[PDB]
């Protein structure tokens, strides 16, 4: 769908992530000199000694479909969670008047990839004009910084080693 | 823990669901247990669901909602429902025909 949309033009609307630590950073997703992350993604972790329940609403007033790219975080040890998200069992929920999808993180041990043994799951939600987006997590939320514009047009994507 | 067998000679269709509360307290409030659980199975089937507590946008007043699910039991099989909360159980089965029908989105008048 991102291929068929043919445009990564990003609106950067701002959320109020009050009570948790914004802009995350991993040594496996470094930005030049030190740690860094995904440009279009926000990594939230405890405030200081806690992780309150997040409830952010972000309506859509423009006349076009908005595409939200978010996700959840999966720690490696039952303590890696505690460590990050306080609660011992996260919970993420993204919905609209017509949508809704909820995810719980899976704690475990994956193979060692680029240092890290835990990882993230990427999801998407589109909200049609005249509907609101709602996020409600009490842990592991890897929130989005805004929406991608949605084109209809005539574009695609192809695997090819032919030089242009 | 309920069981409801199927003796008739035809496929029975069960339409049920599970309820998702807005707050970790709206659960407590309604289903006591801090975490619902619903299971609907048969000798060959089986499907279980756990509620996702949270805040959905305001719809028709409510900020919580329900998740609709289905289960059919072939003649000579039994249906089994086992929930400790949030169960939106069914009052019976729908008949299952094979025939030649369909559905169409149209605004043309009959």
């Amino acid at each position: 769908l991102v291929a068929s949309s043919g445009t990564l033009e990003f609106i950067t609307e701002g959320f109020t992530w009050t009570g948790v630590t914004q802009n995350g950073g991993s040594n496996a997703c470094k930005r030049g000199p030190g740690s860094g992350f995904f440009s279009r993604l926000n990594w939230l972790t405890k405030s200081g000694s806690t992780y309150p329940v997040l409830n952010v609403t972000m309506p859509n007033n423009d006349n076009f479909d908005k595409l939200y790219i978010w996700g959840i975080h999966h720690p490696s040890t039952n303590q890696e969670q505690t460590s990050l998200y306080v609660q011992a069992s996260g919970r993420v929920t993204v919905s609209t008047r017509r949508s809704q999808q909820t995810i719980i993180p899976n704690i475990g041990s994956r193979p060692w990839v680029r240092g890290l043994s835990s990882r993230i799951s990427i999801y998407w939600t589109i909200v049609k004009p005249g509907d609101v987006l709602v996020i409600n997590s009490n842990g592991n939320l890897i929130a989005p910084r805004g929406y991608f514009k949605m084109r209809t047009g005539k574009s695609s994507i192809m695997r090819s080693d032919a030089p242009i | 823990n309920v069981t409801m067998p199927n003796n008739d000679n035809f496929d029975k269709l069960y339409i049920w669901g599970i309820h998702h509360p807005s707050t970790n307290q709206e659960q407590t409030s309604l289903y006591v247990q801090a975490s619902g659980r619903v299971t609907v199975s048969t000798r060959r089937s089986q499907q279980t669901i756990i509620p996702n507590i949270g805040s959905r946008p305001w719809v028709r007043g409510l900020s919580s909602r329900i998740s609709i699910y289905w289960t059919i039991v072939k003649p000579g099989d039994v249906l089994v429902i086992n929930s400790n909360g949030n169960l939106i159980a069914p009052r019976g089965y729908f008949k299952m025909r094979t025939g030649k029908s369909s559905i169409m989105r149209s605004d043309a008048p009959i």
Epitope: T16, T18, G19, T50, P52, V53, N55 | Q25
Partner: antibody, heavy 120, light 109 residues
């Protein structure tokens, strides 16, 4: 500490200004819920003083606006009460709390509450 | 603007009686914006019934709940030493949130 804590003086002289405070812990008072002040008099009669939801500077005070005036400090995540010019009539127990609301549901949080005394 | 009046204001009964509180109301309120609070001395009102008839996270069975137009109720299967306190029906219809007086409840012994 992880709910609501009232605060302020135990007293003041009729006329000065009263200035309560509630310290919430566990929810950005900007994430839903209506943060309100409720007090009951010596005679034990609960009176609804008003609010201010996540909805921001809304306040949406009662029918004694003249002075009941409320604030929030998102940063510190805490909200306040003024009542301006006070009398002895106004001496009582001041409670702060948050309500949930839903057409099919309702659920609140309150507080140890603070006693203020208006006298000289 | 919308006055509520709970009836006995002060009353008593015995461990086992069928106790019943009421609460009238200036105008009408929609069966889901009326609640009840159970306050004991030194505490703070504790919620007891939302949407006119559903017990809040703990209240025990003996408490039924009800109410229609401009008139509601409470009710207890039996009555235990414990249930002994005061009650206030709350209303959330129109904006000036109300509460009215309350109905104290002393016990017998």
């Amino acid at each position: 500490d992880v709910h609501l804590q009232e605060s302020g003086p135990g007293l003041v002289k009729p006329s000065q200004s009263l200035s309560l405070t509630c310290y919430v812990t566990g929810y950005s008072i900007t994430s839903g819920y209506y943060w309100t002040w409720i007090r009951q008099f010596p005679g034990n009669k609960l009176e609804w003083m008003g609010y201010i939801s996540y909805d921001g500077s809304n306040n949406y005070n009662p029918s004694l606006k003249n002075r009941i005036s409320i604030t929030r400090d998102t940063s510190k995540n805490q909200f306040f009460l003024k009542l301006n010019s006070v009398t002895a009539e106004d001496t009582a127990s001041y409670y702060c709390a948050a309500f949930y609301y839903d057409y099919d549901f309702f659920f609140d949080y309150w507080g140890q509450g603070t006693t203020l005394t208006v006298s000289s | 603007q919308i006055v509520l009046t709970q009836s006995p204001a002060i009353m008593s009964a015995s461990p086992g009686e069928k106790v019943t509180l009421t609460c009238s109301a200036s105008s009408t309120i929609t069966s889901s914006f009326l609640y009840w609070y159970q306050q004991k001395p030194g505490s703070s009102p504790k919620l007891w019934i939302y949407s006119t008839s559903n017990l809040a996270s703990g209240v025990p069975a003996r408490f039924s709940g009800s109410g229609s137009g401009t008139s509601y109720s409470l009710t207890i299967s039996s009555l235990e030493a414990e249930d002994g306190a005061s009650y206030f029906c709350h209303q959330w219809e129109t904006f000036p949130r109300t509460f009215g007086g309350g109905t104290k409840l002393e016990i017998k012994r």
